[PDB]
Amino acid sequence: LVDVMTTQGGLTSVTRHGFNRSNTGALMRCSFEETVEILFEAGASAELDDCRGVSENVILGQMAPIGTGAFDVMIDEESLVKYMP
Amino acid sequence: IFVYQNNITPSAMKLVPSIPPATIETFNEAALVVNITHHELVPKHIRLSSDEKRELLKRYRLKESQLPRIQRADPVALYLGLKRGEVVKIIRKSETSGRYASYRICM
Amino acid sequence: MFFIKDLSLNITLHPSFFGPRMKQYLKTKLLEEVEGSCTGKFGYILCVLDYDNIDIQRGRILPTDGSAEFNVKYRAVVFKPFKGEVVDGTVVSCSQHGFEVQVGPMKVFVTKHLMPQDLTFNAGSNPPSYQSSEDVITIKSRIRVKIEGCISQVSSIHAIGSIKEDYLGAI
Amino acid sequence: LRFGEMERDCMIAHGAASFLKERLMEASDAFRVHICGICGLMTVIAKLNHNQFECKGCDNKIDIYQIHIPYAAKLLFQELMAMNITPRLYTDRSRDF
Amino acid sequence: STSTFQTRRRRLKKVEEEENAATLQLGQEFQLKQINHQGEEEELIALNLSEARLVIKEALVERRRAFKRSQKKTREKELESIDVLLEQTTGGNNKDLKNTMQYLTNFSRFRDQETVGAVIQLLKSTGLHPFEVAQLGSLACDTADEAKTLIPSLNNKISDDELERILKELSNLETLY
Amino acid sequence: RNSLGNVIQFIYGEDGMDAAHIEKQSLDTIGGSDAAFEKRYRVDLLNTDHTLDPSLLESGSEILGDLKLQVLLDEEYKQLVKDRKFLREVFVDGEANWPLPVNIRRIIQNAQQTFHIDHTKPSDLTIKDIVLGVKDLQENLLVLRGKNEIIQNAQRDAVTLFCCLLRSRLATRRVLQEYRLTKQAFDWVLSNIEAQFLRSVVHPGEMVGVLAAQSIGEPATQMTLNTFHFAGVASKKVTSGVPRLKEILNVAKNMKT
Amino acid sequence: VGQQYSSAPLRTVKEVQFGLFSPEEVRAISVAKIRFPETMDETQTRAKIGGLNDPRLGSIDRNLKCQTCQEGMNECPGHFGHIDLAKPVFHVGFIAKIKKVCECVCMHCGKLLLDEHNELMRQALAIKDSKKRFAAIWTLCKTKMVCETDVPSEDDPTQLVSRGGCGNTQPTIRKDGLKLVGSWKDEPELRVLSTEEILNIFKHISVKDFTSLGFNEVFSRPEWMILTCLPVPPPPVRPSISFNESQRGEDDLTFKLADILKANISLETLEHNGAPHHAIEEAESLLQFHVATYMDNDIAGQPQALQKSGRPVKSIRARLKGKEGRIRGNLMGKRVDFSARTVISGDPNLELDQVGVPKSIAKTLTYPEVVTPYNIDRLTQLVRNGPNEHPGAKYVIRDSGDRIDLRYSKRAGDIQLQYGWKVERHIMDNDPVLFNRQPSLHKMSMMAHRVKVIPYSTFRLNLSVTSPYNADFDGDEMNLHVPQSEETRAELSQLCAVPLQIVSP
Amino acid sequence: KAIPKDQRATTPYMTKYERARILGTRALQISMNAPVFVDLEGETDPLRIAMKELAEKKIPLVIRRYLPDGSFEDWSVEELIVDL
Ligand SMILES: [Mg+2]
Ligand SMILES: [Zn+2]
Ligand SMILES: [Zn+2]
Ligand SMILES: [Zn+2]
């Protein structure tokens, strides 16, 4: 928590007036106290969203990079062959 | 390094950034009276050669901006006179693990 | 004018075909959804080369169903005509409005008005034809057209051409 | 039953990536839509029979995609377009990072 | 669809699709500078009839072989020999490939992978752009005027005389029937 | 990191350990007089009164004197020492009890009655065995992995505070006179620790952000409100409780106290 | 989801490119000319006029029709129609910036007010962050109030260099209601800034000038904060509510638009008839009002734009505004299917990880299983067992994507299952579930459990798992969500399982 | 960006989140009527089967671990050490 507040430069508060203004994409901040306002000044300045933040995904109903989603899975056809007697 | 007493003329200060490369700094007396860096809480920082950095990044897959930052005007940032870009290696004491490296770029 | 462009594609596969010879089914499904396709973007996908070295890479499992998905990079021979290209082919159909010649997998039509003057149209003929002081163009004769325009359409690419210019016509 | 923020934060805490995607899509909103690969909007005219697709304006037919997002999201995005704001939805990243 | 090795970052305003012609201006997908799967640069691949015929055949043939490695556990004369190859490795509803093979097998100009070789080795010393090296390789031509008219992208790109020495040695290599 | 890429700890908790695997173990090295500390971890093979009484080690009497071992036997000491100092420079309070992965108090208690060790007969450990092993142990409590320096350096760090407990416990004088371990037992104790540790690490996925968050608000919620136990002694009034916490997170200028 | 396959390829969203609607696109996208303000009654005839809501847009009456697009009602996102405004307007939310921008540029020639020349400037033009490189450039121009013609270069302050002309004094500006007013000075000159003008200026702002200010040459030019063509959201956005037939109840939004439309017409008709010059701007404000009060209705300019009966009105914005609304109320938290809730009690006979579900629920909640040789036998068994005997099921589904209501469907008892089919079955002993008590602020407030179907209507849990939920049996209601995939139930089994939670981080 | 089998850096172990998804992912596939590379000693539950498919490390999958900067490291379930 503390580390989060600091880093940036000095003391970034845990409130609409602070952390929720950061370099974080829209929708994510969109999801806290300033909603419509936020969006407006988003499409205003041509924002672009990574869609990397939980909220970003929960809003697009996609699987968010989180534990279970902190990685992709695959089928190694080459190891799929050696697996047959 | 110039050490004024009560203050400098706003007509004066606006002459420092007029002779590059050379750089100039400004400290008040009442300021230097005590070396903050000796304070129980403040832990030692350190400048990093434009290589030890081009490394730190490489070895952390870091984009300049993703690095924790320090204020140009940060007390210790001044005490070591950093520049927009130089990185400092804050090495503190930790109750989790005795030591704990950390870094800070300079904005 | 025929081309060899390097292309890729995505194939969703069911956990079902996740056998020991999966690679097989893929290359297969590839050729099913590839050879014989059309795109004003790529033209006629005719044949896939180097069947042996088709790159499947690793495929990734989806998240709600176990279907996998690979991006199969391949290479095939193509063909997509251009408004200025001079090709010759065999005639096929013919009418009061002009004949239609076939060059490669595509059919290039030719308006009675887009061909020479001294070339009238004869109907009381059989098969139907267009006669000239010395030329005669019917079904099987071979012509050389000058594609004057292209038109992309669903799964094909027709065109309008001419034989009015010089060095064009029957051979 | 309401699966609210709190029960959300809790899953994220657990790491249950998908049991979440579920509660949110496959278990509630979920809806399919056709985006234009050009003007990232809910434009595209999908006549799901003759395959015909189109997006006159960004005048398409070719570059088209289909996606899975809760209905709310479809809604929202429209509501915003309702307020002269255009939330483009893209399927490939160009910024990298 | 079937992506084409180059992701041109389309920024909303998609309006510039220039015309196509014999101004050697072919779609984006066909500039002389296109990218190979490996990730390198490679000149466009322009095939001339007969040169294509062979290429397709080649593949169709060698496909057959590999199509059985896993099963263990004269003009009118080629029309037939081919139809079989197809009724062997093709999907059957590839009416397009068929018609192509006839055209390709009827209008071609070279049977031997050798004569076709000389053709290439010959033309690829003109520095002409692939689409010319192609048309020039699959279109009968006597006068330069005949060539330079059907293929206007030439005109200035080569003295009349030389193009004529090129057309003189094309008729000679022009395999018989 | 967070949704951007910005770091916020180059190691979760500055130690890469998962909260689940931690307890209040004591740092024997810190507390205590310079007097007892010696009477405990000090082993001098060159001295009738400061050598391991053969009734402990098997090769006890054939040691009293070896000068090649008093090189190690000492390298150890100068370390538990360098340690003592390190710690007192960190835990100034003097506080010795801290949250640390791998409970080693127990790991041994098990090693004890799992081999039915008897406090009568002598061990069988080479003094080379102990020291040279406990040294290899730390070589494997890897928390970070990198193939380069920068990282392999950060490793030694995220590990530090631990080893000190380790060495504090696996002291040549300790290992034998306190808990009669045998080559076997010992070699076991070392095995588990290398693991119990490796398991104690944190799993690259764990949404800590949210976890962290939850864990402060949970108790935050139970905090009493506007109490002031000082009231009844005005002028010695200070802001404490939720209104205070508010004050913080808010980064308020005009604080009450 | 949404039923019916589509050639279309299936992808995920990677980026979200927020921009602003250029009037040109608004029309482009639009399918409805949207001329009339009325809803339907083709003179009472039930249908819809080629006027408002469906002059092609989506539909109602359970009728495919949606510009052939058919698919009808469910499976068809409305389409946007447009509605050409007679005279440009402000964008309620953007008034803020539209102003500030002016303050940052003088009219007439419309250009920045501080080039590379003024030094304090440079230091701004470098800050990469369109968000501050702006509130900076502004802090430096709200003061300059004269479009300087010449300023001393990098040499002698004696030699003057020229840039862009016309020094026509710049006016200071103040926000009155929804219009912008500025003064010129010697005894001011107060005149209202006509939108028609502001727009112009903006239109004339340079490319590099856009950018320099927090903008974008492609997705959001400032000239687009001023509405010229109004995008009209289709039905699914402002759905009606029918009380069978002859009884229609439309949505607020549909009404505003109406008023906006009404207002619009009455305005146009005033510039093609007896135009009493300055008696018009008396209804141009009405447009602006509606066109503004439509998106937002909670402003400082008091008039709440009430709707007969004292009802406030529901501004589009009003819908997204946190808690109980679009963003925080429908997306971050949804109500969900396959959920249950009842009073709980203690069972000193269950295992820790178990949760005694009462039968009643088991028989109502269904886990869609996939017909497979491993199960066919046991599966069909349930199917037969019907949806009333416990160990049973209540729906079977074929590859053809169609439901089989096992409680009806003549062929109930019939049916021969198939490899690849699914059988929404009853929850049976040992299915992994997501038990939980509110409020949730602990990982341990939602732990997976081994189901254990039991009699009586109360969820049963083990005492020793009381505190993690922090619940008592004084009539404490708890919830329960049932997994749905095989991978899903795995995330509950291998991660959120009560025993996995015994040690708190 | 791609990382060679060498220069490998990540954990040699399997994140519970990794296993659990695999396990889940597999079972899902199994029940999707997918080939099962092990002798079902009489198992009828796709999970249970997957769990076996795993304790014999005969699961054709490769976890691609992505790194903040975009590059990834691919790890097979054959390799990944399953302690837990
Ligand atoms: Mg209570
Ligand atoms: Zn479009
Ligand atoms: Zn429709
Ligand atoms: Zn001006």
Residue numbers in the entry:
A (entry chain A): 1371 to 1455
B (entry chain E): 109 to 215
C (entry chain G): 1 to 171
D (entry chain B): 1128 to 1224
E (entry chain D): 4 to 76, 118 to 221
F (entry chain A): 857 to 1113
G (entry chain A): 2 to 186, 195 to 514
H (entry chain F): 72 to 155
The study reports:
Importantly, separation of free VP16-Mediator images from Mediator–pol II–TFIIF significantly improved the resolution of the Mediator–pol II–TFIIF reconstruction from 48 Å to 36 Å, based upon the FSC criterion (or 26 Å using the 3σ criterion). We began by docking a crystal structure of yeast pol II into the cryo-EM density map using the program Situs. Docking pol II with Situs represents a rigorous, unbiased way in which to probe pol II orientation, and regardless of where the pol II crystal structure was initially positioned (e.g. outside the cryo-EM map or within the leg domain or within the head domain), Situs calculated the same docking result. Rigid body docking of the pol II atomic model indicated a best fit within the Mediator head region, as expected based on comparison of the structure with that of Mediator alone. The orientation of the pol II cleft in this docking model is perpendicular to the long axis of Mediator such that downstream DNA would extend from the “top” of the assembly. As an alternate means of determining the orientation of pol II within the Mediator–pol II–TFIIF assembly, we used a projection matching strategy in which 2D projections of the human pol II cryo-EM structure were aligned and cross-correlated with 2D projections of the human Mediator-pol II-TFIIF assembly. This independent analysis resulted in the same pol II orientation within the Mediator–pol II–TFIIF assembly as that calculated by docking of the yeast pol II crystal structure. The pol II orientation calculated from these alternate methods indicated the pol II cleft was exposed at one end of the assembly. Pol II surfaces required for interacting with TFIIB, TFIIE, and promoter DNA (i.e., the pol II cleft) are exposed within the Mediator–pol II–TFIIF structure; RNA exit is unhindered along the RPB4/7 subunits; upstream and downstream DNA is accessible for binding additional factors; and no major structural re-organization is necessary to accommodate the large, multi-subunit TFIIH or TFIID complexes. Within the Mediator–pol II–TFIIF assembly, the RPB4/7 stalk is oriented such that the nascent RNA could extend unobstructed from the PIC.
The macromolecular assembly required to initiate transcription of protein-coding genes, known as the Pre-Initiation Complex (PIC), consists of multiple protein complexes and is approximately 3.5 MDa in size. At the heart of this assembly is the Mediator complex, which helps regulate PIC activity and interacts with the RNA polymerase II (pol II) enzyme. At 1.2 MDa, Mediator represents a major component within the human PIC and based upon biochemical assays, Mediator helps assemble and stabilize the PIC. We have assembled the complete, 1.9 MDa human Mediator–pol II–TFIIF complex from purified components and have characterized its structural organization using cryo-electron microscopy and single-particle reconstruction techniques.
